[PDB]
Amino acid sequence: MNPIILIIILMTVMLGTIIVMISTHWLLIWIGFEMNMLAIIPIMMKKHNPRATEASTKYFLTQSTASMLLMMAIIINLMFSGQWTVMKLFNPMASMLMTMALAMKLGMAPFHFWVPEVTQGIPLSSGLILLTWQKLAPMSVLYQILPSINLDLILTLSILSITIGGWGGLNQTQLRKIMAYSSIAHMGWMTAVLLYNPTMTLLNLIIYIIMTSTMFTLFMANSTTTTLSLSHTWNKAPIMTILVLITLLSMGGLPPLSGFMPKWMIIQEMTKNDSIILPTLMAITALLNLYFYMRLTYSTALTMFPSTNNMKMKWQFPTTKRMTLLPTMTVLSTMLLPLTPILSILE
Amino acid sequence: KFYIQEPPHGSPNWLKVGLTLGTSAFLWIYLIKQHNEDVLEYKRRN
Amino acid sequence: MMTYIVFILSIIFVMGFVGFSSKPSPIYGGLGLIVSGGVGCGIVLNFGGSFLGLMVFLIYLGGMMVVFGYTTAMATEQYPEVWVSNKVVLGTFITGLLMEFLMVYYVLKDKEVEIVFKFNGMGDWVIYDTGDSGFFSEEAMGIAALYSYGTWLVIVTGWSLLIGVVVIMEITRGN
Amino acid sequence: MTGRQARAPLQFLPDEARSLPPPKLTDPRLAYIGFLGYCSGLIDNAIRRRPVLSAGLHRQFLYITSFVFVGYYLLKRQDYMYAVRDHDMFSYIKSHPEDFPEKDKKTYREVFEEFHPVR
Amino acid sequence: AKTLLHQYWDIPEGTECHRKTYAATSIGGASGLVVSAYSVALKTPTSFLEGVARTGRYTFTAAAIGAIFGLTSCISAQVREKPDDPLNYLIGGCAGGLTLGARTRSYGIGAAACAYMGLTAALVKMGQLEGWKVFAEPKV
Amino acid sequence: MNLMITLLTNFTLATLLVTIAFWLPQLNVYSEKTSPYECGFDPMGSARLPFSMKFFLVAITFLLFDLEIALLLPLPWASQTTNLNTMLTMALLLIFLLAVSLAYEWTQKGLEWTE
Amino acid sequence: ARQWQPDVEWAEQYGGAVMYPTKETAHWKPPPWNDVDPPKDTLVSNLTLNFGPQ
Amino acid sequence: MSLVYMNIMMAFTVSLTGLLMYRSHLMSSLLCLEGMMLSLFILATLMILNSHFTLASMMPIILLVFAACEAALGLSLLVMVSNTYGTDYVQNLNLLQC
């Protein structure tokens, strides 16, 4: 774990996603996906335990077979119309297989069974950087080949990912499985607008990445895996309490706060079509993905749990950690309600 | 006075604050220059 | 007399490769796999590709060598399974070979097979090169473009392979 | 929508962005941006257990300068995008006369409505 | 499949009875095979006979739901003969929920099944007769 | 299929060697010869026993450098182009990167354990 | 202070493996805190050979 | 249509299902992933050879060098798995529970 080596590996993560962004040849997109996987393995398993071993194993099998399914899709594309241009496809079969390969990649509800596991054991830097890049990079390709996708696939996977991410979040008393189901819910709302106006999808992407960055920074500030540690961080530091309050409420997406600018604009550029019953069912399930946020914030600051002593000992020592960038991403994530005509910065 | 064996800080560095104020004054100068150029550009094209 | 010889090599390829994919012990799996790799090399060599198939047979072989080393290393039973040893493996092998011979029947003695596409069932001398003046055996230059025009592509290829080397080293070191 | 200068995609402000007025001084949105920078610096001093509104005044200056500069370029992008949308809309309006019919907006001396009162 | 749910919608109302009910049984059996395939895929039933027994139970209940719903749909449409109001399918969904409660032999879950399934089935009729689209425009 | 003709003839040669080994010369009295020999002692269990290995890096190292052999093999056909200096630049970059990988795992003692 | 605060039984609700138990809930075990399980041993040790007489 | 295309797609689908359902060995899984790689390889090569698509025939060599280094990554992870256990079945994977 020389820092030269880790700067190299994260530069290759950078290079993989930049290759996915930059290229119109399909082989380069597949290579960028593979390189992203290859570099994202040893960011994990900085631990020794078989937790990280088996979690990386599950990730390897699912992600690798999704990449091979993508290569199948590109091959059937060139058994049809012969072009290496990232453009409109010319096969419903190849588009079906391609969207299902990306569905296994970024996680849909029939395909998400590796996600809470793979976030269960890994350290927090690994989880942060895999969630940010591995949920940014396939959405680029989905933005690229949106005009040739059979709508039932995207729409059904979106609805089902929203309702599974809502339903499964009600039980897990850790932190990372809550975060994984929240990731499923936001990826559902990111995919659900893709056939109508993708500016909304990419705005949903950026705001979700900022929210997750704040979330994982406020879990890097304190070695926390359950709510019990969150109660101890109530009793050790006061500003962390109200920051967890505001950030979890913006994860819920409430109107005066700035988690509402994705949902509301999505309902706008969704209900300017004549689909109404399905968006309002989506938004009722987006009400449903919020109770576990509420019990989390209940456990953090809204109640007062008994804390063990040696926090007496901890009072002398301040939280002199590193932070990635906590306050800037925090107030950029939370006070950004009135800048809704900064929709069009993204397009 | 009153401490033990370590100030981790308390006597502030004379590198970072000078560099940050220098580049921030640079950024204010450049943005004022930008806005003056933009007013001139609008009243130039019209 | 015979004419479908590329298709028949494909049939032998699919037979051995499905018995490969039915997962017996990896010893027998590698046996069926190298059989499948050799006859696939024969397919692509007989189709028009000069060296690429013999090349990929060599590469794929060396991969199977290392795979055999690790299946000697790690996964051993008190008595390992063969195709005809257990119920489930035997059933899967018979059913896969059954689907193969059924496709053989519907291609040979029938007209059209429409499982995913309307595949034209007749012999693969069509379509093919109509005697064009090569003089340089097209795929040779078709690989020789990789060092002429292939600037960015081998850069990212070698870079990813270097990263592959250091990745294997650090995952083994991370004890 | 899709460019409409899908030729230089990274061109954050094209040559056509030199025709509309730039964002003026003390516009309310850039004022709110500066207020957010001030609150950002306040909460950043609140993190590190150092006194609020104290000993981070250079960081106040730096955060406010950074956000005002960023929001300046963002506002210029906003104005360019809405101007090109309006111009493309009006070109497509002027292009097709017959496809966008102007209705005879009749007056109410003869335009009937069913009433259906409430009692 | 879109073709046989299209066959179910394309039964005129109208009476081609026992055939509307056969289509409803086919839809219920398809749904039961879906649910049973997942629930035997993620349980390892120990053993294969018990897996066939569980799938038979779930398809049995869902096919009973489809049959009873088609029967009360046809009976309501023959008695009152008004295809406008969704009240016939409201009675249909509540009958299906009560019979699901009968197949599980609990009463409160059966009553909530009556309520939710009646409202959703009457809503499906209500939106189709009023005319709402299948999930999309997909245009703008 | 001339090579297939020759392969068929050699397989018939091999089968006549099999049959002349088993069937023709003499008889086959059984009942102890089938026992496995090590040195005069019947061993525990059998073979197909879990056998750990020494090399961990060297086999995967073989695999990756065989793949880089596969990249390097169209050097003869590449050698006749109009863009000569670009060919030379990328070829030297390929072998230089390959030797950097080798010397990296050589200085990081990847081969100094149970080779 | 007569303002009621939640207690150890609320904590034991909010602590453990999962929130809502089933008839299967004993198998989900309380996970460790360094995420490493120290006792792991099943005797995967040496193997014999009779390099013998002749 | 050239019937070898359909037959290699048949071999593809069966190797895919073999990669998905599997009894206990991770080794057989990596092995059949390598096989499905070879199937996609041969299919793509026959496509390019019918096309005379001689310009970008980098697809076979580069497709397979990348997918084989994926197989190398998998063998490293299987080394770590069989290091932290004796047996590497579906059992001794049940920790880190969903």
mmCIF file of C-alpha atoms in Angstrom, chain E residues 13 15 18 36 38 41 48 55 62 67 69 72 75 89 109 122 129 134:
data_model
loop_
_atom_site.group_PDB
_atom_site.id
_atom_site.type_symbol
_atom_site.label_atom_id
_atom_site.label_comp_id
_atom_site.label_asym_id
_atom_site.label_seq_id
_atom_site.Cartn_x
_atom_site.Cartn_y
_atom_site.Cartn_z
ATOM 1 C CA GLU E 13 -68.342 -6.911 -22.951
ATOM 2 C CA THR E 15 -70.488 -11.995 -23.442
ATOM 3 C CA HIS E 18 -66.333 -19.165 -19.915
ATOM 4 C CA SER E 36 -43.494 -20.047 -7.573
ATOM 5 C CA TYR E 38 -38.827 -17.284 -7.676
ATOM 6 C CA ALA E 41 -35.369 -20.508 -6.668
ATOM 7 C CA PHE E 48 -37.456 -31.649 -5.295
ATOM 8 C CA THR E 55 -45.153 -24.577 -6.715
ATOM 9 C CA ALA E 62 -53.370 -18.100 -8.012
ATOM 10 C CA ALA E 67 -61.054 -18.617 -11.861
ATOM 11 C CA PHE E 69 -62.498 -13.526 -10.446
ATOM 12 C CA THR E 72 -67.848 -13.241 -10.638
ATOM 13 C CA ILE E 75 -71.958 -13.216 -13.409
ATOM 14 C CA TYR E 89 -64.917 -5.547 -11.037
ATOM 15 C CA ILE E 109 -55.453 -10.792 5.809
ATOM 16 C CA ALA E 122 -61.958 -1.439 -10.206
ATOM 17 C CA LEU E 129 -62.731 2.367 -19.871
ATOM 18 C CA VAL E 134 -49.926 1.487 -21.138
#
